[model samples]
Target: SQFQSLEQVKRRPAHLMALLQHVALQFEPGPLLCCLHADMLGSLGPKEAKKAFLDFYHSFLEKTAVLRVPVPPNVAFELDRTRADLISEDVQRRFVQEVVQSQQVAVGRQLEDFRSKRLMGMTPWEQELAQLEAWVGRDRASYEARERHVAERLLMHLEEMQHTISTDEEKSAAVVNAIGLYMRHLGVRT
Candidate 1:
């Protein structure tokens, strides 16, 4: 188990450190980095690989965000941004796809059944979720000048979905999580 290795590293085991750090030393640009140390600094942590595997277990969002061309002063663009930035949708669809495909467990099959069978039916909280869904649909690479404002509204809505959760634990868990994934599938966290 990788968790076994993680624990081995936890005890400051020489071989385990050598292994993970050896992977790191390869100059691999792993944003994950086991992030046990970095997780303490940010929202990440030792709980990550499990968190990631859970993504595999969960049913994937059937909807993907579409990238749209930014309009207006046709060629107006920024020195700081890239063609990918100019073109890429703000949502990180690739990340979820990567994690979801990596799993081999049978334990996680209930998600798609839940998503297709249950989530598609619409919750009592449908209206607010619809608003966030509307936001997700709009071209994230908006023609607007301030990219910062565009980025800010995304997090605000992610938090707003959390605030809108219902009292039923099962319903709340399913609803918020489904919405969270819809928002998070384009995995750019601030």
Candidate 2:
């Protein structure tokens, strides 16, 4: 039964590919660009994904719905109708191959910038915490505060990461862990 759903699926990969190709042909290059940008940014958080999808839909579909463009009916629908289909393996793979391949080189550069700007922002706090930890023993209040600071830093990073991708249960887990870390440092019994 592993292939049951796929077998029963009416839409072939070729058909989907053709549809995408047709959609690509109908609209101006602008809509496709919007789609790509939305998809990339949508990978961040659930909230961001929703927002990006709506923006893309409005820009590419809704605004042109009454026009003579060949925009797909599915595209005119809201994000919930299309998100699952858009994220399908075949589409995602093609997006990577066709759209993301050339941009791959820039990804590392962007990440470097992100790291330098966001990740490094915590360094000063971390250094201060380290110094405080060294001055006060692990059980000392100052050391405890340092640990809490570390937890807060981690929480901040997680929040930032969440903003960059779709919200998932994993993110919730990270938040929970961050809270736990803070509570542990505080010596809270709960």
Candidate 3:
């Protein structure tokens, strides 16, 4: 699998790794490499990917944060930030689609059988149309639910980190805002 592990990420060209790391660090007002890394791991992928990305992301977050307080903002950072975020969302959509489509083969055939049997109370042609609609609708709903799960899990993880990290109201606000920023990118409406 191309989406195997942090080792997969690590094995990439150094420049790509650097850009990924840098973008991971640049999510404004709070730490989100953890969120991004966790999102990647949330897919039905490798255990090593989960552990290594979690460890690597946290380590990078910890170190870079030591130097984070004084860095001024810039267009370059903004550009890279948007790039990484778009890439993240696109990858997530593709991963979920892959999982859903893999299952669709079996489920789709089942739907076909039901349609052929007129179990849905429609003519065969109508059932054919509805079956396509049904599969597309199911896929859409499945992906949306998965995306929401990602957001919820990331928020839960953030709260866990906050328990270990802070209690300042401002800090908590920043964390939620960062989460909101991420959700917005994915067109998650709540």
Candidate 4:
């Protein structure tokens, strides 16, 4: 429902633009301004504000030159390098043990009819429908299996990348770039 509302708002560009302008004008020095002028003036003392404004105006031309800029690398790296660490034997063993225990518990819990009962608001038929809906699609086991498969693949590639980086910096850069691209392709933001 929230997504539907957002889609409706997004479809009207003029409405969106008007909203932005209204927001912007709220901060401007005009009758439409929502905040008190004294509050804004209090942010900087009268003398300091005038001097600061003049300084800002005069320095605008040289602002770009004065600003710090990052040096772009040939290859971008993914922030979540933890995926590589998960390939370690210790991590793999822990993951396997945890997955097995959790899955067993979940399966056992699902077997209990009383425990499986839906919330008070749901009718018996609705509860049954919800359970059917849940199981109709790829269920828990399949999802876990897919996760394990991905973990295995990531481990393999991470090992290869680590080995390649040991001798060749260029190859290492490419590996980092590849990792970054893979992460982005998977919709990972950080």
Candidate 5:
């Protein structure tokens, strides 16, 4: 279903939660992008992670692929759908799903790091992610309620990162880390 506005999603947190939960869990059943993780982790320490993440998020927002490519100015269908194999309904959706999955997988190997021997208990700013599961759960709450809960948490996180996190660099790293935690919220929920 399509929403009229972000405000509509705001009023119904449970719905938003389902959408985001799916978005977040998108990293779970994956093709693993841990190498991408190794790449970033290798190059940047906490200080660099922040600038990198902030830069990444800004580019993510403004330069969103969906922000342009798929739905070009007057195209009836997106580039992904142009494939003849995607002419079938289920095929098109599945193909797009794979595209989205690969995108996140490329960046999501980091989520699996809490237990990697190369790392320890965790970074100072890393979330207590034994897995991405805990940030969300299989609760029976209304879709609206669930959406609201996650939405509130995401906002508080952005704020917490903005205020409490000082020049420690790791603080920004926390924001960066949470970016993966909050991945599902980054794109189309439908």
Candidate 6:
């Protein structure tokens, strides 16, 4: 009888999700950042809890990026293996349900207030977030479809790289860099 490595067989969406979160942190403030923070809060501690929540509020309202995330040395080989999913459906689903939808409702309310009354001047970042949120709320249908497209493209990209990309060092660099670039290609801007 022969046994195999459970880590090799197990799906690694958690690993990929962690990778995406790291990449997303580097990009400009946007809706995805909000969702990422929300997901993070679920698992983080008290000290971190304060920082993340405060970071979110300041970043959103003040348009200031405060978090300095250190890049990891390499993408683990376990994380690079092909899987049925590129991101954790459970986690992503919660993010959309808990973060995206709720924020949409909250933003919609704020937008209504902004319209109803002559509020203070909106900063460029404020205007950008408003427009981006409005775009998502408007589509409705494009919501999941576009979200799925990112995962699909990401899967193909990673799988293809595994075949042609040589060396773990090169593969790690490519995958990490590609994740950041790929995520930027998704969401409201595109």
Give lDDT for model 2. 0.36
What is the per-residue lDDT of model 4 for residues 1-190, given as tens digits with 9 covering 90 to 100?
1112222322222222222122222211111111111122224654554443233222211224121112112101221233433344444334323323333332233222212332343212233233333443557555434433443344344444454333545434433343333333232222
Clashes of each: 4, 8, 0, 0, 14, 0
Clashing pairs in 2: 43-165, 44-164, 44-165, 44-166, 45-165, 45-166, 46-166, 46-167
In model 5, the Cα lDDT at residue 57 comes to 27
Model 6 collision count? 0
lDDT (10s digit) by residue, model 2, range 1-190: 1112212211122211212222222322232233244345434565555454444444434554321123434333433455654565444334333433343333334323333533445222334333443555656566545544554454454444443322444434433343333233333322
**Candidate 4 lDDT trough over 10 residues, lowest sum:** 29-38
TM-score of 4: 0.19
Per-candidate local distance difference test: 0.30, 0.36, 0.36, 0.29, 0.35, 0.37
Best by TM-score: 5
TM-score for every candidate vs. truth?
0.21, 0.24, 0.27, 0.19, 0.29, 0.25
User: Number of clashes in model 3?
Assistant: 0
Where model 3 places Cα greater than 4 Å from the true spot, the runs are 1-141, 153-165
Output the TM-score of candidate 6.
0.25
Write the residue-wise lDDT of candidate 1 on 12-53 in tens digits: 222222222223222221221212222221233424533542
Model 6 over residues 108-139: C-alpha lDDT tens digits? 34334333332354211233223333444566
Rank all candidate structures by their TM-score, best first, as comma-separated numbers: 5, 3, 6, 2, 1, 4
TM-score of candidate 1 on Cα atoms, chains taken together: 0.21
Model 1 per-residue lDDT at 101? 32
